[PDB]
Amino acid sequence: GELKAIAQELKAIAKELKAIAWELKAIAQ
Amino acid sequence: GELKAIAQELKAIAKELKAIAWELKAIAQG
Amino acid sequence: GELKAIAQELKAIAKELKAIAWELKAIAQG
Amino acid sequence: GELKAIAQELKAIAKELKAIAWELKAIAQG
Amino acid sequence: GELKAIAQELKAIAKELKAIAWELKAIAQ
Amino acid sequence: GELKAIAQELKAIAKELKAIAWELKAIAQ
Structure with a gap:
């Protein structure tokens, strides 16, 4: 449901921040 | 509902971070 | 309600990240 | 309430991202 | 409980963004 | 459950922002 969907978007956010850390x-x- | 709206804003946040990663x-x- | 307030702050966060992407x-x- | 506290921390996050946008x-x- | 824990992690996120602003x-x- | 999962993803986000601050x-x- 909606709370799992929220956790999954936060996982995608952590993944993009990992990519930003790598570029930096x-x-x- | 408001919980779907929260998930949708987090999706927009992930999209902007993807754009920032690309610009970096x-x-x-260069 | 408080859940709408949360969605609205996440919208403001997405807006600031969009500005950061543009500055980067x-x-x-370009 | 805990939901108001969450909205208030997201407001502080938006404020820090605004500062980052300004520095960038x-x-x-320009 | 879990809602206070969420608020506390958001506080840690605001603190890391403050550090990033300083480094920039x-x-x- | 799902609220703990959300707090854990926010912890991972704070960790990636710390890494970004360190690179900067x-x-x-």
Whole structure:
């Protein structure tokens, strides 16, 4: 239901932030 | 319902973070 | 209600991330 | 109530993202 | 319980965004 | 249950933002 859907969107948000962290690491080197 | 509306705004947030990741990749790769 | 208030703050968060994406595009040079 | 507390933290998050957008605008140079 | 735990993680998120704002200000010189 | 799962994803989000702050600190030095 809707609470699982919320947890799944937060998982997608964490995944995009992981990608941002990786790109910033690239910029840092 | 309001819980679906919350899930939809989180989807929009994930979409903007994807765009930010792409722009950071652009900055990283000139 | 409080659930609508939560959805509205998430909308404001999505709006600020959109602005950040645009500024990063500017930094990237377009 | 706990739901109001959640909305208030999301408001603080939107405020920090606004500050980040402003700093990025400074870096962008407009 | 779980709703207080959610508010507390959002507080930690606001704190990390404050740190990011500070680092960006440093980069901005 | 689902509310704990939401708190756990927010914890993962705070962790990724901490990593982003750390990479930006690296770039700042």
